[PDB]
């Protein structure tokens, strides 16, 4: 009866980790979806990002993307609908974890305060064919 936490935490039948590692830089590829009358569609979601509410389980986060006309916002939760979801252009570098002043002035001013963390790419590529050495032994 004690640790009410551990109660609420063991309740987590959801432990979905079929996704890479991310940080407030970028993200890009795929989400999921339904659209057509009864599922059937794979509407991926590329682009950037915005906010991350990490309640552990209520890990839901809104994305910035920009659809032709203007821009779009969307909150997704980590644990089910977002099929493969897998990003690609992760990148990093942000002096904060709440990017909002972008919805203010947005175009090249973005790409200015937008930098990149090669670091992540480095360890990703290291882990790439160090897994060829994992296709060797251990």
């Amino acid at each position: 009866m004690n640790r009410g936490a551990l109660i609420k935490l063991v309740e987590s039948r959801y432990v979905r980790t079929d996704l890479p590692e991310f940080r407030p830089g970028d993200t890009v590829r795929v989400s999921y979806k339904v659209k057509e009358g009864n599922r059937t569609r794979i509407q991926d979601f590329e682009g950037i990002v915005i906010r991350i509410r990490r309640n552990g389980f209520n890990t839901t986060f809104t994305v910035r993307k920009v659809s032709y006309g203007v821009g779009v916002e969307r909150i997704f939760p980590l644990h089910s609908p977002l099929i493969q979801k897998i990003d690609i252009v992760q990148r990093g570098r942000a002096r904060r974890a709440k990017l909002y002043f972008i919805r203010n002035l947005s175009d090249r001013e973005i790409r200015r305060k937008l930098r990149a963390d090669r670091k992540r790419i480095d360890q990703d590529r290291a882990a790439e064919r160090a897994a060829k050495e994992e296709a060797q032994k251990a």
Binding site: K35, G69, V70, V72, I75, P77
Partner: protein
């Protein structure tokens, strides 16, 4: 969040670019509006060369909220403003060219002719 003064915009080709919501054509004392309600908006501005003119009362289909509407599938979605199109006094929009994406919000309203024209869906 719309009311009988909420200045709102359009993303169509037809004529008007800005109007002002009058009512919601629903539960008449509701007034609050998200992606689905029906504003009988009064036209405010249009293009000086074409049909449909400034200041004619028009009925109107609603999209794009600025405080994300709570999605059934867990999520939450909104656009970059508060806007949509007109409905005419014999059902459907007097329009023909959408600018930018929509949501399946509209799809859940069952108005497909709009959605087939819709380039991106959310």
């Amino acid at each position: 969040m719309i009311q009988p003064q909420t200045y709102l915009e359009v993303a169509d080709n037809t004529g008007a670019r800005k109007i002002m919501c009058i009512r919601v054509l629903k539960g008449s004392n509701a007034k609050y509006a998200t992606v689905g309600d029906v504003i009988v908006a009064s036209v405010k501005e249009a293009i000086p060369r074409g049909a449909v003119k400034e200041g004619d009362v028009v009925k109107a289909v609603v999209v794009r909220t600025k405080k994300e509407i709570k999605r059934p599938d867990g999520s939450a979605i909104r656009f970059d403003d508060n806007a949509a199109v007109i409905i005419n006094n014999q059902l459907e929009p007097r329009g023909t060219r959408v600018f930018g994406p929509v949501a399946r919000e509209l799809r859940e309203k069952g108005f497909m002719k709009i959605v087939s024209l819709a380039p991106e869906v959310l």
